[PDB]
Enzyme design. Sequence first.
Site, PDB file in Angstrom:
ATOM      1  N   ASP B 164       0.816  -1.251   0.010  1.00  0.00           N
ATOM      2  CA  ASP B 164       0.069  -0.102   0.068  1.00  0.00           C
ATOM      3  C   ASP B 164       0.855   1.356  -0.294  1.00  0.00           C
ATOM      4  OD1 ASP B 164      -2.640   1.378   0.130  1.00  0.00           O
ATOM      5  OD2 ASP B 164      -1.881   1.810   2.140  1.00  0.00           O
ATOM      6  N   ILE B 167      -0.545   8.943   0.894  1.00  0.00           N
ATOM      7  CA  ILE B 167       0.060  10.122   1.066  1.00  0.00           C
ATOM      8  C   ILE B 167      -0.311  10.528   2.569  1.00  0.00           C
ATOM      9  CG2 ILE B 167       0.235  12.638   0.688  1.00  0.00           C
ATOM     10  CD1 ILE B 167      -0.100  12.035  -2.190  1.00  0.00           C
ATOM     11  N   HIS B 168       0.415  11.054   3.588  1.00  0.00           N
ATOM     12  CA  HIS B 168       0.062  11.175   4.876  1.00  0.00           C
ATOM     13  C   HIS B 168       0.735  12.298   5.262  1.00  0.00           C
ATOM     14  CE1 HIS B 168      -1.285   6.899   5.641  1.00  0.00           C
ATOM     15  NE2 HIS B 168      -0.396   6.665   4.638  1.00  0.00           N
ATOM     16  N   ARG B 169       0.426  13.107   6.363  1.00  0.00           N
ATOM     17  CA  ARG B 169       1.150  14.089   6.806  1.00  0.00           C
ATOM     18  C   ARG B 169       1.615  13.674   8.233  1.00  0.00           C
ATOM     19  NH1 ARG B 169      -3.896  18.095   8.589  1.00  0.00           N
ATOM     20  NH2 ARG B 169      -4.615  16.722  10.336  1.00  0.00           N
ATOM     21  N   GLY B 185      -9.598   1.671   7.898  1.00  0.00           N
ATOM     22  CA  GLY B 185     -10.138   0.926   6.667  1.00  0.00           C
ATOM     23  C   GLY B 185      -9.195   0.724   5.417  1.00  0.00           C
ATOM     24  N   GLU B 287      -6.679  22.676   7.769  1.00  0.00           N
ATOM     25  CA  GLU B 287      -7.523  21.619   6.953  1.00  0.00           C
ATOM     26  C   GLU B 287      -7.899  21.889   5.595  1.00  0.00           C
ATOM     27  OE1 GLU B 287      -6.489  19.072   9.921  1.00  0.00           O
ATOM     28  OE2 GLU B 287      -7.112  18.610   7.659  1.00  0.00           O
TER      29      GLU B 287
END
Lengths: 488, 489
Positions: B164, B167-169, B185, B287
């Site tokens: 997998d 994209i994360h922060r 999920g 956000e």
Amino acid sequence: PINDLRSAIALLQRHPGHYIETDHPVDPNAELAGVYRHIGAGGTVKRPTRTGPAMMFNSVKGYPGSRILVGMHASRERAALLLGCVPSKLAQHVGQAVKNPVAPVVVPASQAPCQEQVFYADDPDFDLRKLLPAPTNTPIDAGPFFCLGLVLASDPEDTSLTDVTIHRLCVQERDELSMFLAAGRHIEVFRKKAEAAGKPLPVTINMGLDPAIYIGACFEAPTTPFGYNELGVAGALRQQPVELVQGVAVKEKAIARAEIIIEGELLPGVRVREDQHTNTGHAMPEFPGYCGEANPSLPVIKVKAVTMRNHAILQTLVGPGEEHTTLAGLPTEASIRNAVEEAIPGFLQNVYAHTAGGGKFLGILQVKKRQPSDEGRQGQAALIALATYSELKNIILVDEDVDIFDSDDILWAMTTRMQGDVSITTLPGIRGHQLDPSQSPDYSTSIRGNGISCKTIFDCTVPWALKARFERAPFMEVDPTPWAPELF
Amino acid sequence: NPINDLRSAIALLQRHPGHYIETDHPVDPNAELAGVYRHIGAGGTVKRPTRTGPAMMFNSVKGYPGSRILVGMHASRERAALLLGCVPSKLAQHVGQAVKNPVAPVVVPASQAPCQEQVFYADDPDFDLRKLLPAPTNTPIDAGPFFCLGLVLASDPEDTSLTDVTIHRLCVQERDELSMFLAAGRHIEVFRKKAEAAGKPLPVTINMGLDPAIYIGACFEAPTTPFGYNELGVAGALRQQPVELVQGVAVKEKAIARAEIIIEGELLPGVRVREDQHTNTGHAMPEFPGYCGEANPSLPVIKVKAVTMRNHAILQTLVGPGEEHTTLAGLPTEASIRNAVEEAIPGFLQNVYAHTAGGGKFLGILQVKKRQPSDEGRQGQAALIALATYSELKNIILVDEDVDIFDSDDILWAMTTRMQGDVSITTLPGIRGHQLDPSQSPDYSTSIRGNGISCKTIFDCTVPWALKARFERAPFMEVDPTPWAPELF
């Protein structure tokens, strides 16, 4: 300083991007408008379009020595530059000059550049169609059009009562134009007086002016003896009275420093079909962005003389797009601003007569809730806006941290500060405007006739109790000029 | 001439003036950095004044000589279209075409891995992530320094053939620790649960400074194949050149070979941290809707084992997240909505815009063309399909083919002259939307039963079929205006 069209052009030339010229030939019939559609028409004109520079066409096919100018007012940034104020304060600026006018003055013909050249109509080689290149906007218009005719007219029974209005005219014959007059306007009253006695009504069509005159004439003005009071706004904006000169062939005055002036009189007991020579069924594009229908019964102006300065600039518009938004939206914003500030002082922050509604149909109000009792006042402000400008349709309410001139930021407020079953109030069956084609019984069963509409208030303001949850991300206050000087 | 990394992409932007600038003026990565780019190119839902503009390289970082920070690479639809060789209106189609014919990545030795030109192991006692990377803070109230464009690679701790990429922060917490949120999920979250159950960490690589094709393609839905890393197949198809992978140096996972910076770490089981533990601002980060998010109370910790970067490594991140988020999130939104409507109603939908005012997620603009009487009534069908396809959508606006769906002025025009409030507006209460919309609260509406639930509204601004002859926009003569003003074209 600025006191006519050419001195205004000089100021625009000191700010690059607001004025350009071209020597490549152009056809005043549809081709010119088609070109400026891509450059600076803007407003409700079909895409692609944008706000751009005012444009001068020096080579006019079939009219040697003529030069046509469009888009002078087709930019809120340009209009504020021409009057010397911030664009977001432009309506407040002109509104202040409305309250302290400077009356016009009559000057001798020696100070009237508009009469350097004179052309009488009784000359047998006179043809209005060969003397002036009146442009068409679309190939389906009723005919050639002048769209920035500042019309002066006085009551035939008492000359001390005048009227200063902007009209559009369609060239019909070598010495005739058709001109629609709004029912209820003073000049239409003046014309019906003269036609009732079987007399013509002398008028002057003044074109190519200081932008301060065109803008200031669209505002409502008080009435004084031998008034011409609409010109007092430009007199206050320039701190220099607007000069008037006696007409050459009609018993009516004219703008002394105008580029072109058509002298004529409204004929009694004669009507004409607007598109009688083209038979297209339409007149010309209207500010909502659709083609208006040809008026079947229009009064005729009989031209007596045309006076213009040397190398006269013919000024008109295209779209009418952003140009109409400026001329109609600034009065719209001003009368709403006065009505709300009178009723709720210090609550309304700004108002934008959005260019999506031509400066007439859509009103964006920016408010600031300062105290718990200000909750419930945003809808009051929207009712005041609708009551002040009956031709409005929809109102959008936003807070002080929303840029009402940025349509992206407006849609953002509609997205994160709005619930459709809470924030949307409809008002059916309210008289609106005939040129909105959705204001039809064929569009809604709650509409009993043309020009009636449902009117909608979108309250995209944060409820007072929740304002602490809706603070936009606070980025640090910095001057970005050092890191990228070229962009500032 | 072709693009295969971040620096070859910057080279293409330099051939098109207006899309890339640099500055040698010193900038503070704490707040000041983002505050500057807010005026220059943040765009999106950032508070005004703001706009889209050039991507920006800050070559002088206060307290970080030799570092250079990059922002705004995807902060423009035109820039993204130029970076991929297509027109901005067909950008979602061009990528969706590449998604259907991906080109699989290829592993390469460290010989061909510019990302590993430098290696910093965390077992050194003088190791400190703060001294190594100048992670910026967007606002003074952020939870801490943030990396916002970390492409994370991970594999199933049981069946390594299951991969997998996402994209994360990540928020900087210690000299060797980062806090990273994972969406429930998703495969990498399921991978972490299996590892945490056995008391074993999960090896991950954090890839930053990439070909925009990688960042953009990674946001789409990809299949799953053995040792596939399938989200990388879009970038390989967009470049007709497979994405190169390199085995990790300190952890059991591969990394992007052409990347600028790599963070090799592990998700430590059992341990949890709150995002703002060192700042206590109660907030995490701005956000995409435009508000500061709240700090996460329980976040899994990444313990870095090695940091890996090329010579003079560029640190790439975003600001806003503004238009940069709108690009990365909106292109998948439009593509899936377009596929669903074209399947159900062929030839009807002309285009779709995940409007930047919605951050690419909340507001959808649909351009349809009624071709026959039977098309009347299908515009609402098109709106229902989009709502069903992208459940985080809140509002839909329907317009005809003569309305520029990317021009917000033109959208409000259709909402002014082609709409009656008591005819054209359909409200749908009680539908789950998204937690980050602050109006999706019971305190905002009595029809909302909980956070993240909304009323969803369909604005039908299409001309009724029977009236289309009365709503023709004024027909201006078609001309080529170039000879009259060549400097404008």
